[PDB]
């Protein structure tokens, strides 16, 4: 047991996904505009090959709607006035 990001997050009372987003580029884990290489986009299935998609070639780099809404976008109820 040298060190693990999940262990550190648990010790500090934080979310492992939040820690991963913090320590990996912002564009991967948040709905923000940033360059993405064409290879990552994937290609369909060719006659001698199977289909390729980000969901299978980069599961960790996928965005997270829950964290994105928690951090960036406001909640309507928290500001509702009437």
């Amino acid at each position: 047991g040298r060190f693990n990001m999940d262990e550190a997050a648990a010790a500090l009372q934080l979310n492992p996904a939040y820690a991963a987003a913090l320590y990996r580029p912002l564009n991967y884990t948040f709905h923000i505009r940033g360059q993405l290489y064409p290879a990552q986009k994937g290609r369909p299935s060719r006659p001698g090959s199977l289909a390729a998609s980000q969901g299978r070639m980069f599961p960790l780099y996928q965005r997270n709607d829950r964290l994105d809404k928690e951090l960036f976008r406001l909640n309507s109820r928290g500001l509702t006035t009437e």
Partner: peptide, 19 residues
């Protein structure tokens, strides 16, 4: 090419920062 290589490296660093 001498100064051009350094300029390109700096531009790449800036692009990586801004991406």
């Amino acid at each position: 090419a001498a100064a051009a290589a350094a300029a390109a490296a700096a531009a790449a660093a800036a692009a990586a920062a801004a991406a």
